[PDB]
């Protein structure tokens, strides 16, 4: 419903200005802004809003545990990425363990998680945004998104992303604030939302498929525990013992092992400015509740027939998939509530962010592949061969991601955030456990760490592969997946995978002798400060102010946690 002069003109103007900015290059605030830019992504918007609409308020605990994991990065992991002289987590692991097997496995795992949790997610979120605006098919939407991403990459926007990212982080937050205000005004305010959400449900809940038959209230009714982050520890959408503990693992893997954030963080003048950037990122990481989760609840309130679709046929007609329209909440909000003038600007900035992220991820994946896999499979290299290989790899990941859109659409009952977190938790906890063990216990050996990593990979695939093979579905058509394999919340499986990988790493490393201290100097957290050389393997008041600010941030975070408990 954007086919009015007020919308197309603004979108075209916005894209033209972005291209011109890209073309021009052809001729505490920053650190925190860059850190939060990952959560500002439109994929994050869609996932969080859809999960909020589907379940309630609990999905914000993910973001606030990410606050507490950022106050773990800044004070525990950044100081070691500065005492080891290393930059990225795989570089720390290579320096500490040596060899090349660990680095090659990490490169392959990073490429897989880029294709699954980032590339496919961004493509699907852009497709959902375009479908909810132009009413297009998912494949046409992703084709258009890919085309505009190509224009972005060739006009040189990835060479001027400085002036299209850290100032787009203010247009996608002003638009988010304005849309939050509009949604709250439409729903009657804070109290209006909290009175109305529990009573918002679909009216078309019968279905004509004999097997489905009548649909139970449990599925089209909002969860009774929809206003509490502390869901039941066993029968809960987000088992709180996992939302806290079993997420700190995955979120630590992200903010301590995701090259984007690790390097954006290490791009600070001092450790007392990296801490301040982390503090500001945390305060800005408390905002996603009010900006995306509760607006998703308002989306469910205003558009139950669409967002709260429960009938398979209605859900196929609305979502495009029969599982559920959870992940169209924010797109529906944007395309319906906001005015005809600013709606186009909001959609343009969202799509520009999605395609900028896609371009950055394509470039990063090409660089990683060329410099870590083909560089070893053919040491001869050659610039022409490397460029051809990079372009062919971009084509390959684009094709595979396009072939993954149905799975992203139907994953975890149609909840994009649940899909992202499941794919993460099924592959991250192993590397997180290996990294933590390497940081803390010096007994870890290189071959032991590699064997632990690969064992965690195998035992996490033993749950990722069958889950996608059998599907997830919803109450209406529950998947025919084994109970013992599928019932356990993916975060509980995250904890189990973390601990199993740790136990395997200890078992393997205890078989052989440890690496001497000459290769551990200034690498272990317990031996950071030694004032001795190594053989390699190939303030007074500002600090107090930063500490007090961190304490204030934690106090605010715990206040909000208790308020929404």
């Amino acid at each position: 419903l954007i086919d009015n002069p007020a919308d197309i003109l603004v979108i075209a103007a916005y894209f033209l200005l972005v291209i011109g900015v890209g073309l021009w290059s052809m001729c505490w605030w920053p650190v925190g802004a860059s850190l939060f830019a990952s959560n500002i992504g439109s994929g994050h918007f869609v996932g969080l809003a859809g999960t909020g609409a589907a379940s309630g308020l609990a999905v914000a605990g993910f973001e606030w545990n990410a606050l507490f994991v950022v106050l773990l990065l800044g004070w525990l992991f950044a100081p070691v990425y500065l005492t080891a002289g290393v930059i990225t987590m795989p570089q720390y692991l290579r320096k500490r363990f040596g060899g090349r097997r660990i680095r090659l496995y990490l490169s392959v795992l990073s490429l897989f998680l880029y294709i699954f949790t980032k590339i496919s997610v961004d493509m699907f979120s852009g497709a959902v945004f375009i479908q909810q605006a132009l009413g297009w098919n998912i494949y046409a939407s992703v084709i258009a998104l890919l085309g505009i991403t190509m224009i972005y990459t060739v006009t040189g926007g990835l060479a001027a992303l400085m002036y299209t990212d850290t100032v787009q982080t203010f247009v996608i937050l002003g638009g988010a604030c304005i849309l939050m205000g509009y949604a709250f005004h439409e729903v009657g305010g804070y109290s209006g939302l909290f009175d109305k959400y529990l009573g918002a449900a679909t009216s078309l809940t019968v279905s004509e498929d004999p097997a489905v038959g009548n649909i139970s209230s449990f599925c089209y009714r909002p969860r009774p525990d929809s206003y509490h982050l502390l869901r039941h520890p066993v029968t809960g959408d987000l088992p709180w013992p996992a939302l806290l503990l079993g997420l700190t693992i995955v979120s630590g893997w992200y903010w301590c092992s995701d090259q984007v954030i690790v390097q954006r963080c290490l791009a600070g003048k001092s450790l007392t400015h990296i801490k301040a950037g982390c503090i500001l990122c945390g305060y800005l990481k408390l905002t996603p509740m009010f900006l995306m989760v509760m607006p998703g609840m308002i989306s469910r309130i205003l558009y139950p027939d669409e967002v709260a679709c429960v009938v398979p046929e209605v859900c196929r007609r609305v979502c495009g998939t029969e599982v559920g329209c959870s992940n169209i909440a924010y797109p529906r909000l944007v395309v319906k509530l906001m005015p005809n003038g600013l709606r186009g600007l909001m959609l343009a900035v969202m799509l520009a962010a999605l395609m900028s992220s896609l371009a950055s991820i394509f470039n990063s994946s090409s660089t990683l592949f060329t410099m870590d896999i083909y560089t070893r499979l053919r040491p001869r290299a050659g610039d022409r061969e490397l460029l051809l290989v990079g372009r062919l790899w971009v084509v390959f990941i684009v094709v595979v991601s396009v072939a993954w859109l149905p799975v992203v659409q139907a994953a975890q009952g149609g909840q994009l955030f649940d899909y992202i977190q499941a794919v993460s938790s099924y592959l991250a906890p192993p590397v997180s456990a290996v990294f933590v063990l390497a940081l803390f216990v010096p007994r870890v050996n290189e071959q032991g760490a590699f064997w632990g990593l690969i064992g965690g990979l195998l035992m996490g695939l033993a749950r990722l592969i069958p889950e996608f093979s059998f599907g997830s579905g919803s109450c209406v058509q529950p998947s025919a997946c084994p109970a013992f394999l599928c019932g356990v919340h993916y975060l509980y499986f995250a904890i189990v995978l973390f601990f199993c990988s740790g136990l395997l790493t200890l078992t393997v490393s205890l078989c052989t002798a440890p690496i001497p201290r000459k290769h551990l100097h200034r690498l272990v957290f317990s031996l950071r400060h030694s004032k001795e050389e190594r053989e390699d393997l190939d303030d007074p008041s500002w600090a107090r102010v930063v500490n007090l600010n961190a304490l204030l941030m934690m106090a605010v975070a715990v206040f909000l946690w208790g308020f929404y408990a």
Partner: peptide, 25 residues
């Protein structure tokens, strides 16, 4: 009420932080 739980959590964490500082001392 919810603000009561928020204040309870804030007080609990402040007490824990004070205990940690005392242990450091």
């Amino acid at each position: 009420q919810p603000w009561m739980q928020g204040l309870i959590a804030v007080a609990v964490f402040l007490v824990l932080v004070a205990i940690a500082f005392a242990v450091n001392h």
